[PDB]
Design a protein around this motif. Structure first.
Motif, PDB file in Angstrom:
ATOM      1  N   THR A   3       0.787  -1.109  -0.093  1.00 31.36           N
ATOM      2  CA  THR A   3      -0.001  -0.403  -0.142  1.00 31.36           C
ATOM      3  C   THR A   3       0.045   1.140   0.033  1.00 31.36           C
ATOM      4  OG1 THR A   3      -0.115   0.231   2.307  1.00 31.36           O
ATOM      5  CG2 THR A   3      -1.696  -1.546   1.597  1.00 31.36           C
ATOM      6  N   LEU A  47      -6.573  -3.033  -3.236  1.00 34.82           N
ATOM      7  CA  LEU A  47      -6.421  -2.667  -1.347  1.00 34.82           C
ATOM      8  C   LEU A  47      -7.211  -3.786  -0.338  1.00 34.82           C
ATOM      9  CD1 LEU A  47      -4.582   0.560  -1.512  1.00 34.82           C
ATOM     10  CD2 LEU A  47      -3.901  -1.367  -2.020  1.00 34.82           C
ATOM     11  N   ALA A  48      -8.357  -3.379  -0.532  1.00 39.76           N
ATOM     12  CA  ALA A  48      -9.248  -3.865   0.578  1.00 39.76           C
ATOM     13  C   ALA A  48     -10.062  -4.824  -0.103  1.00 39.76           C
ATOM     14  CB  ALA A  48      -9.408  -2.823   1.783  1.00 39.76           C
ATOM     15  N   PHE A  49     -10.509  -5.503  -0.575  1.00 37.78           N
ATOM     16  CA  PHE A  49     -11.329  -6.675  -0.475  1.00 37.78           C
ATOM     17  C   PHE A  49     -10.968  -7.862  -0.724  1.00 37.78           C
ATOM     18  CE2 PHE A  49     -14.365  -3.793  -3.246  1.00 37.78           C
ATOM     19  CZ  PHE A  49     -15.250  -4.068  -2.781  1.00 37.78           C
ATOM     20  N   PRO A  50     -12.016  -8.593  -0.564  1.00 39.91           N
ATOM     21  CA  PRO A  50     -11.664 -10.098   0.150  1.00 39.91           C
ATOM     22  C   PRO A  50     -10.969 -11.268  -1.038  1.00 39.91           C
ATOM     23  CG  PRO A  50     -13.937 -10.125  -0.258  1.00 39.91           C
ATOM     24  CD  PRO A  50     -13.535  -8.663  -0.454  1.00 39.91           C
ATOM     25  N   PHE A  66     -13.730  -8.223  -8.662  1.00 40.32           N
ATOM     26  CA  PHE A  66     -14.688  -7.435  -7.916  1.00 40.32           C
ATOM     27  C   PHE A  66     -15.032  -6.306  -8.200  1.00 40.32           C
ATOM     28  CE2 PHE A  66     -17.054  -9.248  -4.137  1.00 40.32           C
ATOM     29  CZ  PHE A  66     -17.768  -8.199  -3.498  1.00 40.32           C
ATOM     30  N   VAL A  70     -18.659  -4.213  -8.869  1.00 38.85           N
ATOM     31  CA  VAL A  70     -19.272  -3.457  -7.438  1.00 38.85           C
ATOM     32  C   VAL A  70     -19.831  -2.291  -8.962  1.00 38.85           C
ATOM     33  CG1 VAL A  70     -19.650  -2.401  -5.350  1.00 38.85           C
ATOM     34  CG2 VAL A  70     -18.586  -4.155  -5.760  1.00 38.85           C
ATOM     35  N   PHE A  73     -23.087  -2.911 -10.672  1.00 41.56           N
ATOM     36  CA  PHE A  73     -24.223  -2.728  -9.807  1.00 41.56           C
ATOM     37  C   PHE A  73     -24.596  -1.485  -9.184  1.00 41.56           C
ATOM     38  CE2 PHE A  73     -24.805  -2.844  -5.105  1.00 41.56           C
ATOM     39  CZ  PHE A  73     -26.290  -3.741  -5.291  1.00 41.56           C
ATOM     40  N   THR A 278     -19.821 -13.857  -1.410  1.00 35.13           N
ATOM     41  CA  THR A 278     -20.509 -12.122  -1.605  1.00 35.13           C
ATOM     42  C   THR A 278     -20.095 -12.092  -3.222  1.00 35.13           C
ATOM     43  OG1 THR A 278     -19.711 -11.737   0.546  1.00 35.13           O
ATOM     44  CG2 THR A 278     -20.599 -10.146  -1.851  1.00 35.13           C
TER      45      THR A 278
ATOM     46  N   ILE B  44     -22.965  -2.530   0.300  1.00 30.71           N
ATOM     47  CA  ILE B  44     -22.114  -3.640   0.228  1.00 30.71           C
ATOM     48  C   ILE B  44     -20.832  -3.843   1.189  1.00 30.71           C
ATOM     49  CG2 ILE B  44     -20.193  -4.134  -2.159  1.00 30.71           C
ATOM     50  CD1 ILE B  44     -23.037  -4.759  -2.592  1.00 30.71           C
ATOM     51  N   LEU B  47     -21.296  -5.521   3.371  1.00 30.72           N
ATOM     52  CA  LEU B  47     -20.988  -6.654   3.151  1.00 30.72           C
ATOM     53  C   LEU B  47     -19.437  -7.107   3.108  1.00 30.72           C
ATOM     54  CD1 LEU B  47     -23.852  -7.325   0.104  1.00 30.72           C
ATOM     55  CD2 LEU B  47     -23.536  -7.727   3.459  1.00 30.72           C
ATOM     56  N   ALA B  48     -19.002  -6.675   2.193  1.00 27.74           N
ATOM     57  CA  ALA B  48     -17.802  -6.962   2.117  1.00 27.74           C
ATOM     58  C   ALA B  48     -16.604  -5.738   2.454  1.00 27.74           C
ATOM     59  CB  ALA B  48     -17.841  -6.975   0.524  1.00 27.74           C
ATOM     60  N   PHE B  49     -15.555  -5.516   3.248  1.00 27.00           N
ATOM     61  CA  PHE B  49     -14.738  -4.725   3.732  1.00 27.00           C
ATOM     62  C   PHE B  49     -13.711  -4.665   5.108  1.00 27.00           C
ATOM     63  CE2 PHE B  49     -15.766  -0.672   1.487  1.00 27.00           C
ATOM     64  CZ  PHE B  49     -14.223  -0.575   0.756  1.00 27.00           C
ATOM     65  N   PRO B  50     -12.721  -4.428   5.185  1.00 28.15           N
ATOM     66  CA  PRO B  50     -12.255  -5.548   6.305  1.00 28.15           C
ATOM     67  C   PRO B  50     -12.672  -5.207   7.836  1.00 28.15           C
ATOM     68  CG  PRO B  50     -11.201  -3.749   5.414  1.00 28.15           C
ATOM     69  CD  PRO B  50     -11.956  -3.550   4.615  1.00 28.15           C
ATOM     70  N   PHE B  66     -16.349   3.019   6.755  1.00 29.90           N
ATOM     71  CA  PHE B  66     -14.469   2.763   5.517  1.00 29.90           C
ATOM     72  C   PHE B  66     -15.685   2.950   4.404  1.00 29.90           C
ATOM     73  CE2 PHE B  66     -10.631   1.369   5.466  1.00 29.90           C
ATOM     74  CZ  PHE B  66     -10.372   0.820   3.337  1.00 29.90           C
ATOM     75  N   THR B 278      -5.320  -0.157   6.544  1.00 33.77           N
ATOM     76  CA  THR B 278      -5.644   0.573   5.501  1.00 33.77           C
ATOM     77  C   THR B 278      -6.609   1.840   6.012  1.00 33.77           C
ATOM     78  OG1 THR B 278      -5.923  -1.497   3.864  1.00 33.77           O
ATOM     79  CG2 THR B 278      -7.071   0.405   3.108  1.00 33.77           C
TER      80      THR B 278
END
Ligand SMILES: [Ca+2]
Ligand SMILES: [Ca+2]
Lengths: 335, 335
Positions: A3, A47-50, A66, A70, A73, A278, B44, B47-50, B66, B278
């Motif tokens: 990062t 950086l920040a997503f599964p 992903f 998003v 969507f 997800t 979202i 659902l999907a974020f640290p 976030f 992050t």
């Protein structure tokens, strides 16, 4: 320092390009802003997503995927609120040439008397749709990785075209076209090549062989709905199948579907980790929102639809899926 | 079923509100689309974020935080490309009343002859800035959780106002205002109340007592820059300190900073988990981008700046931070 290096070099490039350039033209400013927002959203996604189920090529690529999912969507959620004039104005802004474009189905004759064999018509098939069928089915065989399920989808799509032939009168094809070309050759060779590639490159090969009787049926329904939203969008918002919107959306959907099919197969028979993640839900919602946007903005094709076929192609797809599942189970059991 | 219930009820409500309402007014359509995009981006995000470092109130809330942080960062990245006219048009669209608004510093006299004690002037201080100082410092004491660091920031902000008094000629305050009210009372009581609340409610109390000599200095620099971007934005894009933009951004920055300070304290002396996550980088980039946007769009305040003070307030903040660190180390060592 992932990062640290990724969010200090790009920021310097951003401030450099922002200060050095001019700001007179407003629409160019808005376009550059949109591009930079998309780029930095992809960076934030990396950086920040599964991670997801794939880790072979790069775990970061399936975070940009992903992020794109998003973005699409949210774009559909937005587009659901404009009226037809605003959506057409947005299309004209994306490409002004779309201002002068006629439907390929308004003035055209399909399913003409089909007994002739002269080479005048046969060689003129490899223009757009034959390329689309062949290489799109190579991509779909890479996504599905099965001879059974791919052939089942190839056979079900012809039934879908036949049932939805009263809304878009371009699905009408000569009976010696669907069975011979679209099934036996134009898709058959595509599946064969896609699977030969999936074997050459070191990949897996799913099996899909309880809860699977309904799971595979829902998968088939979502697949057909996503393959039909293409023609729905092409017919409601008039443009051609060669405009970058069409094949751009096709490639984007292929990319988004590559991890979705794996997550769904994992939630299916593995006797292991389950509770599909997800990305699968996001793809299902993307398909549903495309369907809803088509139903809202068109409102003219679906005005003359028949509920004697919308609830009958469901039963036909269900029967095809059950027969394919039983055939695959038998082939695996006896061999 | 978290995602199953959260992404199937909201979708039904979305399609209901989209179909039932009208679509005639274009700007209302764009506003509803923006609101729905923000809402579904927050979904979202949940659902999907640290998760982050906080888990007390709800781990999901610090995912909406976030998401808001990423939204503001992307909004700044976009705003960096428009020109002044487009940004002013966007402001007028957000609130038309901003069309008629004058600067509080263009026509106003500050730091007048200050020896009078008549009650005509003293009681007329609790209008906006006294409330802001007191309750904003309660919030800052909740964010920082220390008497040493909070008082150090309260003393450093007066030096920042004194050094940046040649750009925005409203930082000019009577010497018997800064030392008495803004420091001893208007902030002193605020810190006292914030810490009494942080003790009443079952919270922690950070200590901040090598690498800390520069870490706390960078933290102080980012804090002062973020507290100064408020007045920079208020002066470049003309509006008042009571318009919802000002206190909205203040509350938003407080919310975004609540986890950032914890992550930075974790990366600081814990002798444990490190490599700050992050959210801290996103907040640092948000501060830097606000500074860059101010420098770009103003270009008139900073045209007459002096590099004899921009590189001197740095040394003054460094000396204050070093003295505060040494004093805190001594107080912890001998007591
Ligand atoms: Ca066909
Ligand atoms: Ca002050």
């Amino acid at each position: 320092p992932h990062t640290i290096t990724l969010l200090s070099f790009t920021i310097v490039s951003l401030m450099y390009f922002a200060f050095t350039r001019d700001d007179s033209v407003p629409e160019d400013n808005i376009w550059r802003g949109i591009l930079s927002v998309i780029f930095f959203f992809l960076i934030i996604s990396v950086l920040a997503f599964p991670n997801g189920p794939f880790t072979r090529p790069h775990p970061a690529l399936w975070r940009m995927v992903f992020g794109l999912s998003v973005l699409y969507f949210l774009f559909l959620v937005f587009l659901l609120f404009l009226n037809f004039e605003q959506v057409k104005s947005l299309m004209y802004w994306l490409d002004p040439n779309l201002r002068y474009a006629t439907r390929e189905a308004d003035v055209m004759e399909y399913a003409v008397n089909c007994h002739v064999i002269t080479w005048e018509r046969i060689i003129s098939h490899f223009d757009i749709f034959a390329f689309g069928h062949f290489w799109g089915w190579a991509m779909k065989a890479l996504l599905i990785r099965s001879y059974g399920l791919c052939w089942t989808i190839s056979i079900t799509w012809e039934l879908t075209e036949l049932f939805f032939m009263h809304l878009l009168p371009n699905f009408a094809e000569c009976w010696w076209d669907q069975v011979i070309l679209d099934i036996l050759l134009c898709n058959g060779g595509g599946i064969w090549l896609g699977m030969v590639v999936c074997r050459f490159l070191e990949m897996r090969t799913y099996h899909w062989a309880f809860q699977r009787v309904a799971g595979v049926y829902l998968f088939m329904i979502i697949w057909q709905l996503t393959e039909l939203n293409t023609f729905f969008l092409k017919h409601i918002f008039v443009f051609q199948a060669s405009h970058p919107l069409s094949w751009g959306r096709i490639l984007f959907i292929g990319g988004i579907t590559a991890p979705t099919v794996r997550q769904y197969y994992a939630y299916l028979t593995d006797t292991q980790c389950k509770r599909v993640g997800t990305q699968c839900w996001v793809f299902g919602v993307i398909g549903f929102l495309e369907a809803i946007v088509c139903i809202k903005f068109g409102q003219d094709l679906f005005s003359k639809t028949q509920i004697l076929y919308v609830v009958l192609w469901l039963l036909c797809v269900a029967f095809t899926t059950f027969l394919c599942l039983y055939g695959m189970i038998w082939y695996a059991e006896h061999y």
